[PDB]
Amino acid sequence: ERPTFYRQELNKTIWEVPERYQNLSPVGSGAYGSVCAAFDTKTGLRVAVKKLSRPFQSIIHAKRTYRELRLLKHMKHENVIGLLDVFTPARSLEEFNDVYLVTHLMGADLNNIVKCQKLTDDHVQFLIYQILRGLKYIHSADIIHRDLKPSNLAVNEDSELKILDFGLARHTDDEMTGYVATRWYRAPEIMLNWMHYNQTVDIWSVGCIMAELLTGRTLFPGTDHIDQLKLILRLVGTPGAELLKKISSESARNYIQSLTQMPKMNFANVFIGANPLAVDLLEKMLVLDSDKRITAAQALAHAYFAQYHDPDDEPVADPYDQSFESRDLLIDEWKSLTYDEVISFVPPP
Ligand SMILES: O=C1c2ccccc2C(=O)N1CCCN(c1ccc(=O)n(-c2ccccc2Cl)n1)c1ccc(F)cc1Cl
């Protein structure tokens, strides 16, 4: 039941897709890869389509292609980007050399829309509520986003949100250097590799994002790793004895101890005028010791989200098997695994 495909060239790139997809038009000019907006005549849905070209040029790329396909296929939740379709014009494994990923078209990211703007409390409630609802789902699958930031939150005109880029963290050191948003939303334990981190790193990011929506200002806009750590500790206090022991990195621990101790600041005096429940939630997300941060499941039940919370409509996911991460396979083996995942795709109900 292979559909009929047609070809067209968009900004020097050939797109060969099923007839059901019409009105293809480029988006982003290429800064984020080959992406097009389109209309899915079969479902009546506006869609975003990403074409991965030569996804098997090396072991590293082949494995990355497999990883992204596996992650996207696993996610089926309103607040997480997932797959409406995935296809290849190839008729066999031999000619298989391109992968197209189809998702809901959102059309904008939170950073591009609200940067530098203070949002109303009810708007922050709605936006953070959806982020946490999607995070609860992602975390229940044993997946860590690792790089949550405004630019990774796809939003439409009605402020509906879907989380992008979960589980794909390949930021170069240079990209994390200096006065950059690539590092401002990172939990300290991961920014400076203090210990083996876990899903709690994402809650810190949500805290950074929430504070910024409430104030219109980046919470920890460090000029570099060290400056940023100082900005963080000035707000949440230097590490106590209990947390110091959890820092398994001897070098990191020794550096932290060289700093003058500081107490946690009063958040009501930092976030002046904010809803007391938002201040309380921020204090519960922005805890230095990750073991003590509120989890996404617990935060959804927090009073701040009383107007949105519904325990019968905050679904969890099936467990995600990432055992493949520990394997070293050849390009062709990764490619065959990817091909299997493409041909076994089953459209959403
Ligand atoms: O990650 C970004 C981003 C962030 C901010 C601004 C623009 C962009 C962008 O083009 N990308 C790359 C595309 C990221 N993807 C999606 C999906 C839906 C979606 O509305 N957008 C999207 C986000 C912001 C501006 C335009 C678009 Cl079209 N992006 C995406 C994810 C997974 C998949 F399988 C296919 C696709 Cl097409």
UniProtKB/Swiss-Prot annotation:
Principal location listed in the UniProt entry: cytoplasm
Q: Name one GO biological process term.
A: positive regulation of myotube differentiation
* Activity control summary: Activated by cell stresses such as DNA damage, heat shock, osmotic shock, anisomycin and sodium arsenite, as well as pro-inflammatory stimuli such as bacterial lipopolysaccharide (LPS) and interleukin-1. Activation occurs through dual phosphorylation of Thr-177 and Tyr-179 by either of two dual specificity kinases, MAP2K3/MKK3 or MAP2K6/MKK6, and potentially also MAP2K4/MKK4, as well as by TAB1-mediated autophosphorylation.
Residues in Protein kinase domain copies: 21-305
Effect of substituting residue 317 to T: Lowered kinase activity
Compartment list: Cytoplasm; Nucleus
- Keywords associated with the record: Acetylation, Apoptosis, ATP-binding, Cytoplasm, Kinase, Nucleotide-binding, Nucleus, Phosphoprotein, Serine/threonine-protein kinase, Stress response, Transcription, Transcription regulation, Transferase, Ubl conjugation
Annotated SMART domains? S_TKc
Q: Which domain of life is it from?
A: Eukaryota
| Top EC class for this record | transferase
**Post-translational modification (record):** Dually phosphorylated on Thr-177 and Tyr-179 by the MAP2Ks MAP2K3/MKK3, MAP2K4/MKK4 and MAP2K6/MKK6 in response to inflammatory citokines, environmental stress or growth factors, which activates the enzyme. Dual phosphorylation can also be mediated by TAB1-mediated autophosphorylation. TCR engagement in T-cells also leads to Tyr-320 phosphorylation by ZAP70. Dephosphorylated and inactivated by DUPS1, DUSP10 and DUSP16. PPM1D also mediates dephosphorylation and inactivation of MAPK14.
Any one GO MF term held by the record is:
enzyme binding
Q: Which InterPro entries match?
A: Kinase-like_dom_sf, MAP_kinase, MAP_kinase_CS, MAPK14, MAPK_p38-like, Prot_kinase_dom, Protein_kinase_ATP_BS
Q: Which residues carry this modification: Phosphothreonine?
A: 13, 177, 260
Instruction: Enumerate the catalysed reactions.
Output: L-seryl-[protein] + ATP = O-phospho-L-seryl-[protein] + ADP + H(+); L-threonyl-[protein] + ATP = O-phospho-L-threonyl-[protein] + ADP + H(+)
Q: What is its EC number?
A: 2.7.11.24
Instruction: Write down the required cofactor(s).
Output: Mg(2+)
- A GO CC term attached to the entry: ficolin-1-rich granule lumen
Q: What is this protein called?
A: Mitogen-activated protein kinase 14
The organism encoding this protein is Homo sapiens (Human)
Q: Which gene encodes it?
A: MAPK14
